[PDB]
């Protein structure tokens, strides 16, 4: 899971 964006 990216810390900066929820975009795939």
């Amino acid at each position, epitope marked *: 899971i990216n*810390y900066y964006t929820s975009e795939p």
Partner: single-chain antibody
Amino acid sequence: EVQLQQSGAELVRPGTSVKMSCKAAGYTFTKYWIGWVKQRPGHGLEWIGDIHPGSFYSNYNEKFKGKATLTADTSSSTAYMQLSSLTSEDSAIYYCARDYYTNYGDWGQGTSVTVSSGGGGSDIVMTQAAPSVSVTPGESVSISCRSSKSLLHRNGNTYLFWFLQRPGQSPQLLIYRMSNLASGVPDRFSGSGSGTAFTLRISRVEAEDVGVYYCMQHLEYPYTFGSGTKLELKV
């Protein structure tokens, strides 16, 4: 079970601010993005922004920059949204939802806020041509959605989602990544897509299927919804 407990209804004066809360239980709060959605009467669903409660990074729909402020408190496992300079356009039900690998599967119960009496050109537009459809119980239906840009990602997945909002309920996820059924969803439901054109089908409509069906893209910010198709029973 995952619980998102939102704060109570607010009745407020124009020009003031209100701050609402979303307390998370049953999963690790710092691990997942939390998004916020606006349900205004006559205006379907609209995505405001999201926040990562570990890192505290937040991303906003340009439309709500300077209106909405998202914060999180890891000690109380609580996400907050503040709305400033309130106007009648801000009267709505506001939801928090947990983002599970792009699925908004868990929703708060909503917080009602009632206010007393050229940007966004790059947004992906989601079109539901039919505002309503009437079906004889036991008969089939198809519901269309299209996007203004392909929702295919370089990873090969297509970031199209279908939600059902039953009367008096929060939205619930039905179909994720174009074709996959959410847990517990009957095999009467299916999702297909062919380019930027998507179709939800229900093979035999039943009473519990009544409500408003929304498509949504989770490809790129700001996330966007179609305007909804209300499924009603034909008598």
